[PDB]
Amino acid sequence: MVLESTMVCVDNSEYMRNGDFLPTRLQAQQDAVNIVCHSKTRSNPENNVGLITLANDCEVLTTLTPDTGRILSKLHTVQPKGKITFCTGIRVAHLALKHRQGKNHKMRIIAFVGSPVEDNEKDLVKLAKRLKKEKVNVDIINFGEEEVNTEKLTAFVNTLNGKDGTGSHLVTVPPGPSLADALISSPILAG
Amino acid sequence: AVDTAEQVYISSLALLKMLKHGRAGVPMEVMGLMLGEFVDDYTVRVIDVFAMPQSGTGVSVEAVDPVFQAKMLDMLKQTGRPEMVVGWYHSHPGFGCWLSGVDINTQQSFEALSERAVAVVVDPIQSVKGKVVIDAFRLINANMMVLGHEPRQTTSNLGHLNKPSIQALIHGLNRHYYSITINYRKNELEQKMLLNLHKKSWMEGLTLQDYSEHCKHNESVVKEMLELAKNYNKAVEEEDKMTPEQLAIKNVGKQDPKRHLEEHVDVLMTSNIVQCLAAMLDTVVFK
Amino acid sequence: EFLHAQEEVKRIQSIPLVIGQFLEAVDQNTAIVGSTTGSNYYVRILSTIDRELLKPNASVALHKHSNALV
Amino acid sequence: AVQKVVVHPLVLLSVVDHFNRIGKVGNQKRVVGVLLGSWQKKVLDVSNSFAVPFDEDDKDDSVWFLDHDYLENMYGMFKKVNARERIVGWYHTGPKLHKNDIAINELMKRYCPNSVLVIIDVKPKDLGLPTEAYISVEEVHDDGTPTSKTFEHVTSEIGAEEAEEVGVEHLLRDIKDTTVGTLSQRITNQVHGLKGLNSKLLDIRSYLEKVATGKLPINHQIIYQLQDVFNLLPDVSLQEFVKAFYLKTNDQMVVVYLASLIRSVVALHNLINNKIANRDAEKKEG
Amino acid sequence: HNMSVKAMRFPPKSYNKDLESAEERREREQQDLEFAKEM
Amino acid sequence: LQSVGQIVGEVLKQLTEEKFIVKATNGPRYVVGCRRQLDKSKLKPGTRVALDMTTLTIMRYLPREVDPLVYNMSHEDPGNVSYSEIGGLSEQIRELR
Amino acid sequence: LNAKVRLLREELQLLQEQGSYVGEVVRAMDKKKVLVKVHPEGKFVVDVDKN
């Protein structure tokens, strides 16, 4: 019985908009977000969800709210554009987790990857250990044009949760054009 | 039981908020709720107040409306302010300080929720440049009076410093409720900040005014000075030709130059001296 | 202190006002005036007001309850 | 656009206690809130304000967080109690303006196309006003950018309403001006002016010292204004100016002469009256 | 002028008389107020 | 059953921004205040106003009175007589018309 | 100066008392009784103060 506050971090870059899947990866994000937010709503009725975008400079669309329809409507009007600034996006997401009405709630951040990322090893390891210092768990969904062997992501697994605990998890890219939400239905509960 | 040494401490912001809110709705009785804490059972501190929506076409509003109150209480917490409500307040415009008949029933609800609440009444139009009229009351029950006992047991003499007004006695007061003393808490930071009112920039003290209207004003003043000078000796001569018992009443309808010339002298001297000195130092401050 | 004290006496001027006609001044700070209600009164004058403006048929404003010249 | 802004003491007290109650929890540096007020002609009035959750990181000046829903619902909630007020701008208690101010101003320009930024100092140490008012504008020059966003200052002052005036008068029991006359007309005007002028000259001294030795980002508008300042100083050695000055001073002193004469006459009359009236009181006792 | 005001208050002396309104009128006023309150 | 009436009077002039002097239907004249939200540009001398019965503050302005006698006099004619029922004076009727 | 200040405060206090009517006396009586008539009412027979 956990009270959980979730932050969704959605990509809309110019590589994510690529359409290797049967629909555009936009619709993959929409229906994946739909199923995960529905799962988190039946996880606990008084949970709340917030939304932020990844662009040249990140920006928040909705503060933590228990409602669902506003999130769907807000993300439905998004337009694919921009680059990826993963580090600053995670930083402002962590800022949004603070100043939260649910002081007794449990933090949770879910991230989307659909574009190449220019991450720095020392920067990412410092960020990972700092985020551990404040007891923060992060789940990351990589798909589409995946990073090379997700090797940067692997460093996170080495640094972030994954050792002496199962508080974090990573889902690999689903290469097939078929609906990826059904494939990722299992790890979200088995993470 | 309760004693007569109970104290209430009101901040400056709460006072100014409630005063402005009461003055805004002058013709009717607006109301709101306070918030603070009870550090002990001798002193109660109030730190913030907020007004509440009213139903128009009347002069009284029922306090039962849980949605707004609950929303405000759960929203103020997000930015500090973990305090709870301690009572309510409403304003009597130009009447005084008392509790009307319905007011006992209105405060009965707060008494039921918490037995040590208080009611604050502020008079917005009877106060001017000090001596703001604010009173604080609590209710009593008649069954305890049937027992031949009186509430507010007295342990010291600091509770009877102010004698109540006759209009408070005319209404219920001591046979229905008791008043408590009041105090304002002051600190150095807000007091030092607040004294900046009406302060003017350094520009206003170095301008030396136009040299054309000044001579016009002096010329205007000199003529009335001349006329009062001419009228002085007439009143000087007849100062003792009439008995002095009616001397004061003789100056009840017409002006007297003696009192009416000193103000001219004063304003004229002040203006001339300051106008000279300003130019005097300005001639050398700049180049 | 006197400067502060001279200002607190303006508490009796806010709402209670009735218009009347000045009739006579028997002596200092005391007069007789006739209100528009229809009756005359022998009342007391406020100290700080300027006695020079009290002309025979001037119009003045009086307290509602104490019915004193204000 | 905007000529003057007027600030009531209520928002000052609200700023002070908001800063106190939010800084007691932890070591934050800057806090943000939104103002409410009114317009008339070109004069702006500020009445009250409420706080808002704000977060900013010292690591970088490009990351910060505000709340939208909080602002929206709180404005809607204050709408139900007084409909005359409206959003006019925001305030931050920073000692000096920061880099992120342009971004926040752009963010909340949605709710008011003419947002006005106000800076309030929470621990002043001088006699100057605690408030400063800025408005955004687009500036154009030769090269670099067709337009650039830049703040411009607007005159501000502290006003008062009747109820607010009586409240602040009741609160200021200890401190009150000694006399009203040449005293308040001299010290409150002249010496403070000298203080302010010296402070301004010291600040411009400091900036000029920063150049030609240190950083040296030579800027030309400051130089143009300095030339204009140093060219506008009048000359007081001219014969005609001296003659006119002497003529006006000699014209002015006669009035003081006359007034002093009248005062002496009145004093003699008062002395005579008192002596005559009082010498006729000892014999009544027998 | 200053000299004149310096020779101002010499002749006044023995003015200890200080009566405000009355001596026993306070009791009558209090009795009237109590009677009005009772009614 | 939770409302009260208001006295009716006529305004004469205003001393300052917040003070007016008004006369009731009967004799006495009062120096009174006004409501804050009410507009002050419509209060020309001679208009009719409504005042509170416990504080005597301006609350509302009203249109001019119409007497019940004049209202009764305005319209009372169930008759429907036309020019065909009157004869013998066809010249004076033209002179009047 | 102190006497002036105290007198001012007491003068503020003593301005909330009732006024007194003016009337015309027609004729007196025995044992301190007079008959007076004030215009907005009838005739009253009253007594006289001790001074």
Side-chain angles (χ1 to χ4, degrees), chain D residues 105-166:
Chain D
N105 190 179
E106 279 293 335
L107 183 148
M108 71 175 38
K109 192 180 269 186
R110 303 167 196 165
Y111 310 89
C112 180
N114 297 120
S115 71
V116 176
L117 188 150
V118 186
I119 303 179
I120 294 91
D121 280 324
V122 292
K123 41 182 71 175
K125 267 81 65 176
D126 44 349
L127 267 296
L129 283 72
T131 62
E132 185 63 30
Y134 296 128
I135 178 170
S136 299
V137 74
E138 307 291 332
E139 64 91 13
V140 57
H141 47 259
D142 293 13
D143 306 321
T145 176
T147 58
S148 176
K149 282 83 67 180
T150 303
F151 288 118
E152 291 297 322
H153 76 284
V154 175
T155 313
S156 66
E157 54 180 354
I158 307 299
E161 192 260 6
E162 176 191 358
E164 301 176 357
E165 187 171 355
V166 308

Side-chain angles (χ1 to χ4, degrees), chain B residues 2-12 14-15 18 34-49 84-89 116-121 133-138 152 158-159 162 178-186, chain D residues 170:
Chain B
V2 71
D3 47 353
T4 71
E6 186 153 30
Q7 189 68 255
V8 62
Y9 276 116
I10 298 174
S11 172
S12 315
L15 162 60
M18 71 175 38
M34 295 182 287
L35 61 84
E37 73 260 14
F38 316 100
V39 293
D40 55 58
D41 59 356
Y42 291 62
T43 178
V44 177
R45 294 191 330 111
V46 54
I47 197 163
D48 197 357
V49 311
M84 50 191 210
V85 302
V86 301
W88 68 304
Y89 77 100
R116 57 188 285 100
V118 72
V120 165
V121 171
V133 185
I134 298 180
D135 280 13
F137 307 91
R138 291 172 146 188
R152 292 254 280 182
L158 76 164
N162 303 72
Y178 58 89
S179 168
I180 68 175
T181 183
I182 189 167
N183 194 356
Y184 314 91
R185 183 180 281 200
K186 52 197 285 293
Chain D
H170 188 297

Side-chain angles (χ1 to χ4, degrees), chain D residues 3 7 14 43 46 79 112 128 177 190 216 218 231 241 275 277:
Chain D
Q3 292 219 345
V7 173
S14 184
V43 170
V46 184
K79 278 296 294 301
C112 180
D177 54 354
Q190 315 214 337
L216 190 66
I218 292 175
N231 188 86
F241 181 79
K275 284 199 72 169

Side-chain angles (χ1 to χ4, degrees), chain A residues 57 59-65 70 88 91-92 95-96 98-99 130, chain D residues 28 53-57 59 62-69 107 110:
Chain A
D57 177 328
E59 193 276 333
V60 292
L61 278 297
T62 302
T63 310
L64 277 297
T65 176
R70 293 181 66 188
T88 73
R91 252 185 299 262
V92 293
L95 286 180
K98 293 186 305 303
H99 307 274
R130 171 199 278 99
Chain D
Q28 283 189 21
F54 166 88
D55 209 349
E56 179 186 36
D57 197 352
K59 183 68 184 175
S62 292
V63 288
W64 41 273
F65 152 78
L66 278 81
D67 199 357
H68 299 162
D69 303 331
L107 183 148
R110 303 167 196 165

Side-chain angles (χ1 to χ4, degrees), chain G residues 1-48 50-51:
Chain G
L1 274 296
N2 192 31
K4 289 182 70 175
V5 170
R6 185 182 292 173
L7 186 88
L8 182 47
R9 303 186 157 263
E10 309 323 324
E11 190 277 332
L12 163 65
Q13 172 66 245
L14 57 90
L15 277 173
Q16 283 145 40
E17 291 183 351
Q18 295 286 147
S20 53
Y21 314 101
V22 292
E24 288 258 8
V25 61
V26 286
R27 56 95 168 176
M29 283 204 178
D30 54 354
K31 51 196 64 60
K32 315 300 295 183
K33 301 288 183 183
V34 306
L35 193 68
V36 292
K37 168 190 63 43
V38 184
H39 73 275
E41 54 88 10
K43 306 133 82 181
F44 282 175
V45 62
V46 299
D47 66 291
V48 181
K50 64 192 183 144
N51 303 327

